[PDB]
Design an enzyme around this catalytic site. Structure first.
Site, PDB file in Angstrom:
ATOM      1  N   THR A 187      -5.293   7.084  -2.785  1.00 55.86           N
ATOM      2  CA  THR A 187      -4.212   8.038  -2.552  1.00 55.86           C
ATOM      3  C   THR A 187      -3.069   7.829  -3.534  1.00 55.86           C
ATOM      4  O   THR A 187      -2.524   8.796  -4.084  1.00 55.86           O
ATOM      5  CB  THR A 187      -3.702   7.908  -1.120  1.00 55.86           C
ATOM      6  OG1 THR A 187      -2.864   6.752  -1.022  1.00 55.86           O
ATOM      7  CG2 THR A 187      -4.863   7.746  -0.161  1.00 55.86           C
ATOM      8  N   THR A 188      -2.696   6.571  -3.770  1.00 55.20           N
ATOM      9  CA  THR A 188      -1.674   6.278  -4.767  1.00 55.20           C
ATOM     10  C   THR A 188      -2.092   6.787  -6.134  1.00 55.20           C
ATOM     11  O   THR A 188      -1.274   7.339  -6.880  1.00 55.20           O
ATOM     12  CB  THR A 188      -1.413   4.776  -4.823  1.00 55.20           C
ATOM     13  OG1 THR A 188      -2.620   4.102  -5.201  1.00 55.20           O
ATOM     14  CG2 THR A 188      -0.977   4.269  -3.467  1.00 55.20           C
TER      15      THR A 188
ATOM     16  N   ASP B 286       0.844  -1.188   0.000  1.00 51.67           N
ATOM     17  CA  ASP B 286       0.000   0.000   0.000  1.00 51.67           C
ATOM     18  C   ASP B 286       0.881   1.239   0.000  1.00 51.67           C
ATOM     19  O   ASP B 286       1.706   1.420   0.901  1.00 51.67           O
ATOM     20  CB  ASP B 286      -0.933   0.004   1.209  1.00 51.67           C
ATOM     21  CG  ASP B 286      -1.854   1.203   1.229  1.00 51.67           C
ATOM     22  OD1 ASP B 286      -2.759   1.273   0.372  1.00 51.67           O
ATOM     23  OD2 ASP B 286      -1.671   2.077   2.100  1.00 51.67           O
TER      24      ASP B 286
ATOM     25  N   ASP C  81     -11.214   2.115   5.320  1.00 53.27           N
ATOM     26  CA  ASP C  81     -11.464   2.515   3.939  1.00 53.27           C
ATOM     27  C   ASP C  81     -12.763   1.912   3.414  1.00 53.27           C
ATOM     28  O   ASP C  81     -13.518   2.575   2.692  1.00 53.27           O
ATOM     29  CB  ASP C  81     -10.288   2.105   3.056  1.00 53.27           C
ATOM     30  CG  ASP C  81      -8.966   2.637   3.568  1.00 53.27           C
ATOM     31  OD1 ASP C  81      -8.982   3.579   4.388  1.00 53.27           O
ATOM     32  OD2 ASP C  81      -7.911   2.114   3.153  1.00 53.27           O
TER      33      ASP C  81
HETATM   34  N1  LIG Z   1     -10.175  -6.641 -10.230  1.00 51.04           N
HETATM   35  C1  LIG Z   1      -9.625  -5.504 -10.719  1.00 51.04           C
HETATM   36  N2  LIG Z   1      -9.419  -5.343 -12.042  1.00 51.04           N
HETATM   37  C2  LIG Z   1      -8.875  -4.219 -12.539  1.00 51.04           C
HETATM   38  N3  LIG Z   1      -8.495  -3.176 -11.782  1.00 51.04           N
HETATM   39  C3  LIG Z   1      -8.645  -3.204 -10.439  1.00 51.04           C
HETATM   40  C4  LIG Z   1      -9.233  -4.398  -9.819  1.00 51.04           C
HETATM   41  N4  LIG Z   1      -9.268  -4.166  -8.496  1.00 51.04           N
HETATM   42  C5  LIG Z   1      -8.748  -2.931  -8.285  1.00 51.04           C
HETATM   43  N5  LIG Z   1      -8.380  -2.359  -9.445  1.00 51.04           N
HETATM   44  C6  LIG Z   1      -7.769  -1.018  -9.599  1.00 51.04           C
HETATM   45  O1  LIG Z   1      -7.175  -0.590  -8.373  1.00 51.04           O
HETATM   46  C7  LIG Z   1      -7.288   0.828  -8.265  1.00 51.04           C
HETATM   47  C8  LIG Z   1      -7.504   1.254  -6.818  1.00 51.04           C
HETATM   48  O2  LIG Z   1      -6.426   0.820  -5.993  1.00 51.04           O
HETATM   49  P1  LIG Z   1      -5.621   1.924  -5.148  1.00 51.04           P
HETATM   50  O3  LIG Z   1      -6.446   3.183  -5.171  1.00 51.04           O
HETATM   51  O4  LIG Z   1      -4.201   1.962  -5.651  1.00 51.04           O
HETATM   52  O5  LIG Z   1      -5.631   1.365  -3.643  1.00 51.04           O
HETATM   53  P2  LIG Z   1      -4.950   2.242  -2.480  1.00 51.04           P
HETATM   54  O6  LIG Z   1      -5.656   3.571  -2.557  1.00 51.04           O
HETATM   55  O7  LIG Z   1      -5.234   1.462  -1.222  1.00 51.04           O
HETATM   56  O8  LIG Z   1      -3.495   2.297  -2.871  1.00 51.04           O
HETATM   57  C9  LIG Z   1      -8.456   1.244  -9.144  1.00 51.04           C
HETATM   58  O9  LIG Z   1      -8.050   2.287 -10.031  1.00 51.04           O
HETATM   59  C10 LIG Z   1      -8.823   0.016  -9.949  1.00 51.04           C
HETATM   60  O10 LIG Z   1      -8.767   0.318 -11.343  1.00 51.04           O
END
Ligand SMILES: Nc1ncnc2c1ncn2[C@@H]1O[C@H](COP(=O)(O)OP(=O)(O)O)[C@@H](O)[C@H]1O
Ligand SMILES: Nc1ncnc2c1ncn2[C@@H]1O[C@H](COP(=O)(O)OP(=O)(O)O)[C@@H](O)[C@H]1O
Ligand SMILES: Nc1ncnc2c1ncn2[C@@H]1O[C@H](COP(=O)(O)OP(=O)(O)O)[C@@H](O)[C@H]1O
Ligand SMILES: Nc1ncnc2c1ncn2[C@@H]1O[C@H](COP(=O)(O)OP(=O)(O)O)[C@@H](O)[C@H]1O
Lengths: 196, 487, 107, 478, 492
Positions: E83-84, E50, E360
């Site tokens: 956030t990322t 994360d 979250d």
């Molecule tokens: N099954 C999936 N298939 C494609 N994309 C996914 C899937 N699950 C999550 N994502 C991608 O992950 C992203 C969100 O993760 P992220 O915001 O990086 O988590 P965090 O905020 O905890 O770092 C979204 O933009 C989404 O497109």
């Protein structure tokens, strides 16, 4: 200021394999119908562009003796048939570059060579087994048109490729001898005229 | 990214190579003068790794592999490290071949599951309790050393401790909690005896009575301190409760029992016990059932322990021990009374006992068994290669590389035996393909043959855990993309 | 690779090496075609072990299928035989050589 | 050896970049200080002819530019800068690990779309349909940009319009000759029909002749052998005396002794005339070219109608009026400097060529970068439609096409990041009829401005640029 | 710290770009985990998937990086997810801005273009935010999927169904005023990730022992002042007597449950046992807030003013031993909103990882109940926004069109980064997705379990509209703020 010129056997094999992977992996990109052609420039006053591997290895100059050996006998093979030189060079380079790790494992090169010969015999018998060859290609004027698509499919010459295919089938017909099945130097189908 | 992945690969492979040749009964021993005058002389991989300097993160992960494999099963500590190094070297070729590490990791996970299921289904399991085969495995582990002549004195006692309590922990598996261990310096190795319940080895000097059938047990960690406000109250509480055996903890001050306090504690001649190791304090508490309370006020009628007999008898002539039976929940760690005048017959006996208890628990966690000597590794290197040929996709090459890297263990095992490693490992592979599962190497008889003459035998769980941990750690290392300082 | 399952020792390793060396031609063709050099070759290999058809190659012209019977991609037995035999002769003879000495040393 | 060749081609393109448009920067033709005082030229085509080239890929690009130059019209600067942009984009795409074959395939299928879009917007001019001259005016003016001969440009356009009915049968271009001297102004252009060579006998030779059959000479005790050769030469000149010719090309040197005999025989000794005039006489009048004259006696002679020698304007302004065909329209200006010669020669040659393909192919499109933006819009629309990694290829093709008129905008000193962007955004709605004008420095409907470029040369530019870019991109080593 | 007219902005933008590239890898449900070091003496070798935790643990000095970090902090505090994505989007925008400035384009024009480019993207999201019946006609699969989206790259893939069921019970009967004190996660070590069940209590028992009755109905609960006890000697005896009089004043209430913040030794514990009082020391502030809201136990310093009827009221309180651990359930609350999520993991990292993941999850569930509209995940929304922005840029003249095109490029870069960390050919996949999305409207999207394009709605993997829109807005405003800085004493 303490250079040494000793070449022990295993480091000699390493050097030869490096030279082979230098002469190979260079013309490797030219393999295939859409391979990246090599622009050959003469050291004095000439420049040319071509894709045939035999031609590019023949024009290219090589310093190492191993490379000279391989290219001169590839010239010999080109004289024998004139096809598959790219495949031969890339395959030999592949064998050497992946047998370098066998050498690193400690295997003696004689063992590797004899095993490679045995594998070659296995491959020969296997490819002779799975041949689905057609035997009617004697009076095959129409199939002969699609025989040569692959060797002319790399350019836009397909607009009049059938005309030269008919020219070629007429040429082979007018010299079609069932006894010798050969063409000599005097029967050369070569003449280059600029313009047109 | 790749610039740090290469550094991690190189560091992990280097730290694995430094223990590569120590594998096997013919393992060559090491001597690293990295320190301040350290005379390193041993052939045990775990101690070499833990004493080796750790600077790169990858080396730390590999040392963690060694520790996890040691705690989980206690065997193959060098095996998992060597396997991880081989896997990293193999996947270096894939990384320079252009495969993104996620594909390699997924393929390694598939290879792990396939190898686990092939290794267990066609292995040789044990069905009945069959203490004979446990004794045989122990002898294959407990002999050929100084404790070889003491195998018939140590292994049967451990087996008896196992059969006494078949602990229903972790799928009715005999865990580390059979009957609490004790050991006292002196005596002879023949003095070993099995106990039932809590046993005290601390020095006790009471000229009166300390032997009552209704041995009430209390734990008053609050001792005498230098300021009467909180000095004589514990004596009154003990007298009212009637406790006769109360171990003393010096967690407050050194003067646990002064002359006046001792004389006041001499009117009932309560048992005085000092210097209890902290790790065994909670074990003793759960053995008696009393709570580790350092407050005299909290000490009430519910704080009284349960016991049947408590004697300060000089066991084996000059060994003063306090055996207690019939407690609430005894059985903290398998009992082996390490008695011996010699120094080696203590430390080596304890080490051999630990190895035996690990392997016995290892075989009772899962009742499958395989023949060692490189047989499982060549079996994996064959079956996983067959799978990768049957497996489709671009991860098939990664699976094949995994299988090929699993060949190092027999190769190094044979090299440490002096045989030509390449020829013997490939001969073993051919004999295994055209033959049976049990084909291994005969390291200390000069040759290669089946296991029936050898019968080295090891539990399935050591290899299973080593393989699983190695794959998980190589997965974690491969998924690493960057390491950042300056928190 | 099948033949390496019933083979003596160093010939076994040599033929295992030879299989991977033969696999280079498909990767070279696919890489020159621009597609994934390793993914496509692995996929076509899995398809060719699933199907007994031996014409499942690499379609470098981005046509429909991997079968060149329709695409008329054809090569003679003699040419391929000479190519493979000469490549093997090359690797053998270069492995035979272990030292090169030149008069006129400059130590 | 891909990076070095790409950088060499990019540098070759950048060297000519600044000369694009009718505002291009000037360049200095320097060398070793022996003969490198000062030479300047605005046109970039002549720059390439005098470039010391080392990179063989750059040599191929320069050879392609020369092919474009000696082919129809002048677009060499545009072709070269377009190729440079395409290879810059190709380098950028290779930096993001895109295989050259996919890029080449995408470029091919985008070039075909751009070409068909250019075909779609082609409009046929009225000079070949309803006899309009303003379209001819504009087509002559646009190719004569960055020049000064706008005063007697009417004479240029008169020779342009008079070509279609008389001076060409299927687009003939060899019937027009250009010659000029030093000292004059912009009011010197006039119609001539021959070269400017004067009689050498003296003043007693009549100006008018009867009939001209013009051919080419053969030649110009050892004393006895020399006298025998002299007797043979006198026999030869006696034989040419009865020929009855009045004009005759004297390729080899003739001294006075047979020169007076040539004059007395009615045979004018044209002392080694330029072969250009000989060729013009050959196709207009009918005077063939041979090696010897002894064999031709009565059937192998020349063919002409009337030739006269006159002096006009203090110079040897001989007018070869009255030849068999009235297609030998020769323009005689009077320049001031050496550069006037080659500048006017190349300008008139290119203008006459583009007029030849306009009268051969009457369809045309508006210039000023509107057609470029149209092709870019078409290829961008194509790119948004098909999937695969070639989308990057066609969008880079569009980027190069967009950057092509940005160079024109910059060379005028105007802005480039707004009016080009404004033109692009408008072109979806302010369509092909829109365009870019350097006269005011703004976007206006290009049709009313009337400056249009012939369709044939534009298609040739696009095809040649795409082909050269593909060829250079296909090279990877050596 | 004096700088130059271009060096300061160049180094600040390069620092921001570096911060973006630092977190670029740990994006998507295929993130490349990274090791955080504090080398020192014995720094822990902890590794995380994360990126938000990375920013929490990044030490940087560049003011542009400082602004990006602060914006990411606000991002994490508000919603807790994306956030990322915000950081990498801002980094891509700044990289495009650097490229444009290399083409002598004034930053003010770029900002002017970007403002209404963001406006266009936001209105596109409003247009395409399909409001499903998950919060209208009570569909459950949408809740399933939204919980699955933010739970990716975690270790709760087994009992995620229980978490989704708790989300459903929240959206059914815990949706009082957007409940957030219901997010209670307490867990221990030793076990597996499949140890999820429901609780509503605090995991401390009666310090008296097992002698005090477990079932106590009436609970008058507050916070005490001092430790209990019966010229130092005289003053301490008199203080003891005075405070005993105080407790006799407050003993008439008949309390059973009570929290004593100050430490309790043996004697106060004995006095409490004689008075039938329990004590909890240094409880979690979230636990105190829950006791104040769900139960009614307010926080206080003394007990001077509460004397007769100014004590908290409760329905039922109990404390038991479950599972050989301190498992205490506070059954019988006035309102059952604080459904504590109790787990039993293996490592200590789960203690924070699962808790933040559930924070979250509850935040995004609150967003969904606030705005039932949602958009397809997996790069579909980003591609649609980029398509709308590209359309508007093609329509719009002026120099800001180039800035808008760069904005669209940075938007399209996000699915490329997501696909790269999965090992797939991102360029081919993203190019195909864009070419489809030009005509293959938003029903299509990126599928990750197979490395192929797909119909995103059929996969059902969707993310809430609120978080996506506010991610877009925060990234745009952060890029705009960083861009407007030109030349200050800013770095060394
Ligand atoms: N099954 C999936 N298939 C494609 N994309 C996914 C899937 N699950 C999550 N994502 C991608 O992950 C992203 C969100 O993760 P992220 O915001 O990086 O988590 P965090 O905020 O905890 O770092 C979204 O933009 C989404 O497109
Ligand atoms: N249309 C095609 N489809 C697939 N492979 C082709 C095609 N055309 C040529 N090849 C491959 O290209 C290789 C080189 O062929 P060729 O040019 O005849 O030999 P060389 O390159 O040595 O001159 C051959 O091995 C052949 O398999
Ligand atoms: N007598 C033997 N004959 C053949 N193989 C043996 C023999 N003893 C041990 N081995 C093999 O050598 C390996 C040694 O394990 P090792 O990693 O050295 O354990 P440790 O690290 O605890 O010393 C075992 O996996 C076993 O299969
Ligand atoms: N007066 C003008 N108005 C608009 N565009 C012009 C004008 N003059 C030239 N151009 C543009 O300049 C381009 C050619 O410029 P240049 O390379 O200098 O001439 P050439 O192509 O003859 O070398 C053409 O595409 C044309 O559209």
């Amino acid at each position: 200021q303490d250079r040494k010129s000793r070449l022990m056997g295993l480091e000699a094999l390493k050097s030869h394999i490096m030279a082979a992977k230098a002469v190979a992996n260079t013309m490797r990109t030219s393999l295939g119908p859409n391979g990246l052609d090599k622009m050959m420039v003469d050291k004095d006053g000439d420049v040319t562009v071509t894709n045939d591997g035999a031609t590019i290895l023949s024009m290219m100059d090589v310093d190492h003796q191993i490379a000279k050996l391989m290219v001169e006998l590839s010239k010999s093979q080109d004289d024998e048939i004139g096809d598959g030189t790219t495949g031969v060079v890339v395959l030999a380079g592949a064998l050497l570059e992946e047998a370098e790790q066998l050498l690193d494992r400690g295997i003696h090169p004689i063992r590797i060579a004899d095993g490679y010969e045995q594998a070659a015999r296995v491959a020969i018998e296997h490819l002779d087994k799975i041949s689905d060859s057609v035997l009617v290609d004697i009076k095959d004027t129409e199939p002969l048109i699609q025989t040569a698509k692959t060797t002319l499919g790399s350019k836009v010459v397909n607009s009049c490729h059938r005309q030269m295919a008919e020219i070629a089938v007429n040429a082979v017909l007018t010299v079609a001898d069932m006894e010798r099945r050969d063409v000599d130097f005097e029967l050369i189908k070569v003449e280059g005229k600029v313009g047109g | 990214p790749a610039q740090i992945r290469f550094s991690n690969i190189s560091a992990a492979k280097a730290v694995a190579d430094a223990i590569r040749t120590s594998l096997g009964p013919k393992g060559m021993d090491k001597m690293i003068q990295d320190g301040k005058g350290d005379v390193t002389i041993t052939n045990d991989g775990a101690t070499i790794l833990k004493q080796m300097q750790v600077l790169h993160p990858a080396a730390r992960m590999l040392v963690e592999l060694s520790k996890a494999q040691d705690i989980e099963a206690g065997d193959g500590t060098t095996s998992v490290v060597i396997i991880a190094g081989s896997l990293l070297d193999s996947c270096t070729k894939l990384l320079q071949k252009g495969i993104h590490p996620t594909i390699i990791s997924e393929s390694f996970q598939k290879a792990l599951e396939k190898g686990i299921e092939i290794l267990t289904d066609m292995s040789r399991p044990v069905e009945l309790s069959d203490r004979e085969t446990l004794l045989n495995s122990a002898t294959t582990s407990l002999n050929s050393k100084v404790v070889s002549q003491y195998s018939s004195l140590l292994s049967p006692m451990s087996v008896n401790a196992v059969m006494k309590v078949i602990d229903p922990a972790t799928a009715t598996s005999v865990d580390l909690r059979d009957i609490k261990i004790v050991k006292k310096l002196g005596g002879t190795i023949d003095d070993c005896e099995l106990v039932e319940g809590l046993v005290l080895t601390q020095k006790v000097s009471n000229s009166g009575i300390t032997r009552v059938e209704k041995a009430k047990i209390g734990l008053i960690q609050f001792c005498l301190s230098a300021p009467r406000a909180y000095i004589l109250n514990l004596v009154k509480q003990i007298k009212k409760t009637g406790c006769n055996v109360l171990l003393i903890q010096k967690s407050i001050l050194r003067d646990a029992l002064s002359d006046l306090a001792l004389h006041f504690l001499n009117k009932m001649k309560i048992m005085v016990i000092k210097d209890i190791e902290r790790e065994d304090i909670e074990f003793i508490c759960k053995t008696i059932g009393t709570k580790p309370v350092a407050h005299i006020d909290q000490f009430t009628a519910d704080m009284l322990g349960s016991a049947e007999l408590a004697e300060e008898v000089n066991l084996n002539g000059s060994g003063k021990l306090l055996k207690i039976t019939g407690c609430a929940s005894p059985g903290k760690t398998v009992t082996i009374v390490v008695r011996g005048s010699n120094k080696l017959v203590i430390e080596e006996a304890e080490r051999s006992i630990h190895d035996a208890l690990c392997v016995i628990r290892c075989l009772v966690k899962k009742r499958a068994l395989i023949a060692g000597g490189g047989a499982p590794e060549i079996e994996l290197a064959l079956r996983l290669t067959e799978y990768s040929r049957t497996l489709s996709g671009m991860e098939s090459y990664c699976v094949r590389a995994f299988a090929d890297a699993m060949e190092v263990i027999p190769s190094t095992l044979a090299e440490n035996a002096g045989l030509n490693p390449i020829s013997t490992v490939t001969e073993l592979r051919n004999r295994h393909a055209q033959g049976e599962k049990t084909a291994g190497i005969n390291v200390r008889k000069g040759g290669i043959s089946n296991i029936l003459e050898e019968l080295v035998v090891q539990p399935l769980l050591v290899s299973v855990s080593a393989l699983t941990l190695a794959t998980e750690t190589v997965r974690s290392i491969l998924k690493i993309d960057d390491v950042v300082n300056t928190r | 690779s099948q033949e390496a399952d019933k083979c003596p020792t160093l010939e076994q390793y040599a033929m295992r090496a030879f299989a991977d060396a033969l696999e280079v031609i498909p990767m070279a063709l696919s890489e020159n075609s621009g597609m994934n050099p390793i993914q496509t070759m692995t996929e076509v290999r899995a398809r060719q072990v699933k199907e007994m058809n031996p014409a499942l190659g690499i379609d470098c012209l981005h046509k429909g299928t991997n079968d060149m019977k329709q695409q008329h991609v054809i090569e003679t037995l003699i040419g391929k035989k000479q190519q493979i035999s000469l490549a093997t002769q090359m690797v053998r003879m270069i492995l035979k050589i272990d030292d090169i000495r030149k008069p006129g040393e400059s130590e | 050896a891909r990076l070095t060749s790409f950088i060499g081609a990019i540098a070759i393109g950048d060297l000519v970049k600044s000369t694009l448009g009718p505002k291009g920067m000037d360049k200095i033709l320097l060398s070793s200080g022996r003969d490198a005082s000062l030479m300047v030229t605005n046109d970039g085509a002549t720059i390439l002819k005098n470039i010391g080239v080392d990179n063989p890929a750059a040599k191929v690009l320069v050879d392609m530019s020369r092919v474009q130059d000696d082919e129809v019209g002048d677009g060499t600067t545009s072709v070269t800068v377009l190729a440079a942009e395409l290879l810059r984009e190709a380098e950028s795409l290779i930096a993001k690990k895109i295989h050259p074959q996919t890029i080449i395939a995408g470029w091919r299928e985008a070039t075909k779309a751009a070409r068909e879009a250019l075909l779609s917007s082609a409009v046929d001019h009225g000079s070949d349909e309803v006899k309009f001259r303003q379209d001819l005016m504009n087509i002559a003016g646009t190719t004569l940009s960055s020049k000064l001969l706008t005063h007697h440009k009417d004479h240029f356009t008169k020779l342009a319009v008079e070509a279609v009915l008389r001076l060409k049968g299927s687009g003939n271009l060899e019937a027009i000759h250009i010659i000029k001297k030093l000292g004059g102004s912009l009011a010197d252009s006039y119609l001539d029909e021959g070269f400017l060579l004067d009689k050498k006998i003296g003043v007693n030779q009549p100006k008018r002749i009867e009939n001209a059959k013009i051919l080419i000479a053969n030649t110009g005790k050892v004393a006895e052998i020399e006298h025998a050769e002299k007797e043979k030469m006198k026999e030869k000149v006696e034989r040419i005396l009865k020929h009855g010719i009045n004009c005759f090309i004297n390729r080899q040197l003739i001294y006075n002794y047979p020169e007076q005999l040539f004059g007395a025989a009615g045979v004018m000794a044209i002392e080694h005339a330029d072969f250009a005039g000989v060729e013009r006489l050959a196709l207009v009048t009918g005077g063939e070219i041979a090696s010897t004259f002894d064999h031709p006696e009565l059937v192998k002679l020349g063919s002409c109608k009337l030739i006269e020698e006159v002096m006009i304007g203090e110079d040897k302004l001989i007018h070869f009026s009255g030849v068999a065909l009235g297609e030998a329209c020769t323009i005689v200006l009077r320049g001031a400097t050496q550069q006037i010669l080659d500048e006017a020669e190349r300008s008139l040659h290119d203008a006459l060529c583009v007029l030849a393909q306009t009268v051969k192919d009457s369809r045309t499109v508006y210039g000023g970068g509107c057609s470029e933006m149209l092709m870019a819009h078409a290829v961008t629309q194509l790119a948004n439609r098909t999937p695969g990694k070639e989308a990057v290829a066609m969008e880079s093709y569009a980027k190069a096409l967009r950057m092509l008129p940005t160079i024109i905008a910059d060379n005028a000193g105007y802005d480039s990041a707004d009016l080009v962007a404004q033109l692009r955004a408008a072109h979806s709605e302010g369509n092909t009829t829109a365009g870019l004008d350097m006269r005011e420095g703004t976007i206006g409907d290009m049709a009313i401005l009337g400056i249009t470029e012939s369709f044939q040369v534009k298609r040739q530019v696009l095809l040649s640029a795409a082909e050269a870019a593909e060829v250079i991109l296909r090279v990877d080593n050596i």
